[PDB]
Amino acid sequence: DEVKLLGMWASPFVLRVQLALSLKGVGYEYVEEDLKSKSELLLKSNPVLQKVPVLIHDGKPVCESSVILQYIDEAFAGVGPSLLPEEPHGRAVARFWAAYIDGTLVKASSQAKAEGKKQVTAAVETLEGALRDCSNGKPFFGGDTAGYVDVMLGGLLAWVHAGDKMKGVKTFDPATTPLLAAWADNFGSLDAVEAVMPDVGKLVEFA
Amino acid sequence: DEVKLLGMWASPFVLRVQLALSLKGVGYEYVEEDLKSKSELLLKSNPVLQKVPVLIHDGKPVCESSVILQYIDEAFAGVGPSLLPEEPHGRAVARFWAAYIDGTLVKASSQASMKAEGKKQVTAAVETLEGALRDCSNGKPFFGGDTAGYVDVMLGGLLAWVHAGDKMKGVKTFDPATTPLLAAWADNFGSLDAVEAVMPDVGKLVEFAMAM
Ligand SMILES: CC1=C[C@H]2O[C@@H]3[C@H](O)C[C@](C)([C@]24CO[C@@]1(O)[C@H]4O)[C@]3(O)CSC[C@H](NC(=O)CC[C@H](N)C(=O)O)C(=O)NCC(=O)O
Ligand SMILES: CC1=C[C@H]2O[C@@H]3[C@H](O)C[C@](C)([C@]24CO[C@@]1(O)[C@H]4O)[C@]3(O)CSC[C@H](NC(=O)CC[C@H](N)C(=O)O)C(=O)NCC(=O)O
Ligand SMILES: CC1=C[C@H]2O[C@@H]3[C@H](O)C[C@](C)([C@]24CO[C@@]1(O)[C@H]4O)[C@]3(O)CSC[C@H](N)C(=O)O
Ligand code: NA
Ligand code: NA
Ligand code: NA
Ligand code: NA
Ligand code: NA
Ligand code: NA
Ligand code: NA
Ligand code: NA
């Protein structure tokens, strides 16, 4: 398609890029990376970090899921809806919660063991507040349609579901964070999301 | 037209915001926060993280230095030069190197500052950033070209904190012998009037570092 994703099926960072491409309806070639013996194309395309996702558009590689999400938004502006808000302030809000998901939630969630689990439920509690304040009674961070923040968090949903099914816990417990519980179901049930969301059972085996 | 910056004189993250405002020529109110006893305005403006910088433009706060730089770029468009490249690819390169400075260089120099292992990672990251400069600059003085751009400000924000460390240690982080492009860059960016106007006294930074 002249759009190539260097991927790994179990990565939430790769799932972010798949979700962004799917929501717009941009076609792409998926290439599965073996991260134990990395491809020539991966090592040439991301020489500094050697991680997936990499998006290659028209010979030019793009690295880091949040950078890729923004790239997609700028380069495919005329194809399907935008993830980023139109106005500077709304964009600043979206990038803030993007930074928080990666800098706070993922630092804690990857670390989660007891002490890490204290930080995870604190970060989830904050994200319940983010959703109430961003959404304004609408289903998503982006409003009536899924936006940047929804994709950054939505990318981690299968990872979160697998973790939950292993432990016997709900990260998005309806008793504690009802808005996030409903959001996981609403985002999860989008046709564009269901088309790329990996089987949870398969994730569990991998981990 | 009200720009208030909730700052701390020793923060490289704050100095990023000052650099961007200075390079554009946007006026702002600098407010020095005490991070030991945080103000009511800081606690209300950044309720989730309680960190400086916060930029308040017409009553609306913005948090996280890299987010703030991009906001200024979007909100003050055609006041002075833009920090971000025009084309999506060049912006993706600029955002990549921004993420690398925060995620790799700063993570390593904090681990160095709290020793050999961290010194391996700092040297490694500076080496990589020599390559970023060669590839980004295209024979011009800066990452953003003939004028400073986003990457120059993200790295430029750490120059005071680098120079104090270097002053106390007797070492160059941007050593001419090992990263000559970065050494020339540090001198070029540091000699800009817009940079010089907000660059803290090294001697006061030395003392502050020495306390920690
Ligand atoms: C929350 C969470 C989920 C897990 O998902 C995958 C797996 O289940 C374990 C794993 C380590 C973690 C464990 O915790 C995780 O944070 C994560 O890291 C995982 O491999 C990560 S994905 C492969 C990885 N890529 C990135 O890190 C990209 C990050 C980049 N900032 C982006 O945004 O583009 C890579 O390529 N590593 C190099 C190599 O493996 O050789
Ligand atoms: C390289 C480096 C320099 C030092 O600079 C300042 C000081 O010299 C010591 C200090 C801790 C370090 C020590 O090593 C440093 O990494 C950093 O950590 C320092 O206080 C940091 S600035 C104040 C801090 N802000 C942020 O962290 C914002 C980051 C955010 N991602 C952004 O981008 O907005 C805050 O507001 N903290 C709240 C509280 O103090 O309660
Ligand atoms: C007296 C002060 C002046 C003022 O100058 C610059 C700017 O306008 C805001 C700033 C933070 C201050 C705020 O009050 C200050 O103390 C200083 O901290 C500043 O970036 C300092 S850089 C330059 C100078 N070498 C220094 O270190 O003083
Ligand atoms: Na952070
Ligand atoms: Na909010
Ligand atoms: Na909408
Ligand atoms: Na300039
Ligand atoms: Na606020
Ligand atoms: Na960035
Ligand atoms: Na990084
Ligand atoms: Na300039």
Numbering used by the authors:
A (entry chain B): 7 to 118, 127 to 221
B (entry chain A): 7 to 120, 127 to 224
Quote the passages of the study that discuss this structure, keeping the authors' original sentences.
TaGST-10 was cocrystallized with its reaction product, DON-13-GSH, to observe substrate/product binding at the active site. TaGST-10 crystallized as a dimer in the asymmetric unit and contained a molecule of DON-13-GSH in each active site. Similar to S-hexyl-GSH in TaGSTU4, the GSH moiety of DON-13-GSH is mainly bound by polar interactions involving hydrogen bonds between Glu70 and Ser71 with the glutamyl residue, Val58 with the cysteinyl residue, and Lys44 with the glycine residue of GSH. The catalytic serine of TaGST-10 forms a hydrogen bond with the cysteinyl-sulfur of DON-13-GSH. The DON moiety of DON-13-GSH is in close proximity to the hydrophobic residues Val12, Pro18, Trp173, and Phe220. The only polar interaction with DON is a hydrogen bond between the hydroxy group of Ser116 with the C15 oxygen of DON. Replacing Ser116 by Val resulted in clearly reduced DON-13-GSH synthesis by TaGST-10 S116V. This implies that Ser116 contributes to DON binding in an orientation favoring nucleophilic attack of GSH at the C13 position of DON. DON-13-cysteine is located at the entrance of a cavity located between the two domains of chain A. This cavity is formed by residues on α1, β2, and the loop connecting α8 and α9.
